Amino acid sequence: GKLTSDFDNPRWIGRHKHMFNFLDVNHNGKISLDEMVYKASDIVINNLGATPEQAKRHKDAVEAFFGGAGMKYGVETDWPAYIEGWKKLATDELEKYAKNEPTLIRIWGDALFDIVDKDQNGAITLDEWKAYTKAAGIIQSSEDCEETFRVCDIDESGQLDVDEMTRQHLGFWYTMDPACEKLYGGAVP
Ligand SMILES: O=C1c2cc(-c3ccc(O)cc3)cc(Cc3ccccc3)c2C[C@@H]1Cc1ccc(O)cc1
């Protein structure tokens, strides 16, 4: 694995700058925690049929995750404060990884996969991953969705679970692990 940060890597900055511009759908140069939690909850409730119990769990997880990057309700976060807050989020997540503490990215996955998995067993199929990532907009083509199941160590079903995805997300969002490249296909650089 890799438990060292790489915040000076221009491709780490560019990866999250891509995400920031993807999240700033109204081209305001700034995004709020209200917008992020709305987008997240809108997906699982209105596209994926989450129950109120599932949605509340998922809401607290998304709220914590983006809140870990310094975003707050009623506050607009511009790009400089965004990437600065994302360094603090990656640092806190890397401390949790090292302490074998439940990370914010795992807690979001567990809450999300309970919705995305129709059997609610913490493992999603390729069609279910295409359903979520296209509703979220983070992936547009079915080709990029298939790259996820190539990069990830899929089980024998074969489905993707939170254990494997948390491992991939460690290297993709936090440490720039070369083996975690193309986790979202070509949709996210
Ligand atoms: O990990 C994930 C991630 C990271 C970012 C991101 C990335 C970098 C940024 O700088 C900003 C936003 C953005 C997204 C899309 C999204 C944004 C806001 C509201 C709902 C979805 C997603 C999904 C996906 C959910 C997930 C979580 C854990 C799992 O185990 C499996 C799936």
Author numbering: 1 to 189
What do the authors of the reporting publication say about this deposited model?
The Ca2+-binding photoprotein aequorin is a complex of apoAequorin (apoprotein) and (S)-2-peroxycoelenterazine. apoAequorin, which consists of 189 amino acid residues, can be regenerated to aequorin by incubation with coelenterazine and O2, both in vivo and in vitro. The chiral deaza-analogs of (S)-daCTZ and (S)-HM-daCTZ selectively inhibited the regeneration step to aequorin by binding the catalytic site of coelenterazine in the apoAequorin molecule. The crystal structures of the apoAequorin complexes with (S)-daCTZ and (S)-HM-daCTZ were determined, suggesting that the hydroxy moiety at the C6-hydroxyphenyl group and the carbonyl moiety of the imidazopyrazinone ring in coelenterazine are essential to bind the apoAequorin molecule through hydrogen bonding.
